[PDB]
């Protein structure tokens, strides 16, 4: 019944209206947790991973002049900017954005979806078309970015090698 | 945890008569839980622990080939 | 140890974050 896994029954709490629906939930986490939370969590983890994948792609032929002389490897970079006191400013600013975008209701118990489908945080300054298949395009790019990011950092931990150097001609 | 979960699913909930089968539980617990565990454990001591005590490495890698006594069975 | 960073992440998690989450979860559960 599930489009993605026909041998499994359709996840009941999922619906085709939701963006990026293939009826893919073999563990049935949509039974364990509220779909609206998972949906919000999916798009957010995506949007954060999207920016994380770009961060690694830009800071490799560049590294902004004023922060020059810092390693572009994941763990060394983390250790440098925490020591610097830059990551603590970013933490509080992300903490600020989280409270502002969700307007106080931040808890799984508190967070509500009155006149907003999951993902709609009211951020569309250019005013591009939202209510269409554009949500499915965000999801697909977000899902790819989450696996993408995971592929970058694990490559960075394995052989201490750059994202773009990996796709030249190298095997262990 | 899988077994625990399985046995409170409707088809796998054992009946009250199953739980009060004294003779069966005693046979299995004596011969199986105590008896066979002690037999299997003897296997460990003879195959692994006693060799290890004599500086002979026996593990999963070689235990098929390495006889715990020269005279075999 | 090999992954000598792990205690710096997991001890706060098990010691601060998870107990607060569990207290919060149980509070709501026993007050509704």
């Amino acid at each position: 019944q599930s489009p993605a896994m026909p041998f499994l029954s359709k996840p009941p709490n999922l619906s085709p209206d939701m963006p990026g629906y293939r009826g893919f939930d073999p563990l049935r986490l949509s039974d364990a947790f509220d779909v609206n939370w998972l949906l919000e969590g999916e798009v957010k983890n995506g949007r954060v991973a999207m920016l994380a994948c770009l961060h690694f792609f830009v800071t490799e032929y560049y590294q902004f002049p004023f922060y020059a002389g810092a390693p572009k490897l994941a763990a060394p970079a983390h250790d440098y900017f925490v020591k610097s006191g830059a990551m603590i400013q970013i933490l509080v600013f992300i903490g600020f954005l989280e409270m502002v975008l969700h307007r106080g209701k931040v808890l799984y118990s508190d967070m509500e979806w009155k006149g907003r489908k999951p993902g709609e945080l009211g951020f569309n300054p250019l005013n591009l078309p939202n209510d269409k298949a554009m949500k499915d395009r965000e999801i697909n790019n977000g899902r790819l970015a989450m696996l993408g990011f995971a592929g970058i950092i694990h490559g960075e931990f394995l052989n201490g090698k750059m994202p773009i150097e990996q796709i030249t001609n190298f095997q262990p | 945890l899988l077994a625990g979960w399985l046995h409170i699913q409707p088809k796998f909930k054992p009946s009250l008569s199953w739980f009060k089968n004294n003779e069966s539980r005693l046979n299995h617990h004596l011969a199986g839980l105590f008896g066979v565990s002690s037999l299997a454990w003897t296997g460990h001591l003879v195959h692994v622990a006693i060799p290890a005590s004599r500086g002979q490495h026996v593990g999963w890698d070689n235990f098929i080939s390495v006889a715990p006594h020269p005279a075999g069975l | 140890m090999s992954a000598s960073y792990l205690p710096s992440i997991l001890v706060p998690t098990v010691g601060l974050i998870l107990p607060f989450a569990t207290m919060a979860i149980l509070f709501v559960a026993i007050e509704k």
Binding site: - | L1 | M1, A3
Partner: peptide, 28 residues
């Protein structure tokens, strides 16, 4: 010596026990 990979393999299997534990807990 136990490698980073071995410690992380342990953590995913402990995660699996977590999943199965919650499944049992929720039903009991």
């Amino acid at each position: 010596m136990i490698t980073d990979n071995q410690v992380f393999v342990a953590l995913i299997m402990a995660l699996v026990c977590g999943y199965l534990a919650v499944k049992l807990a929720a039903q009991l």
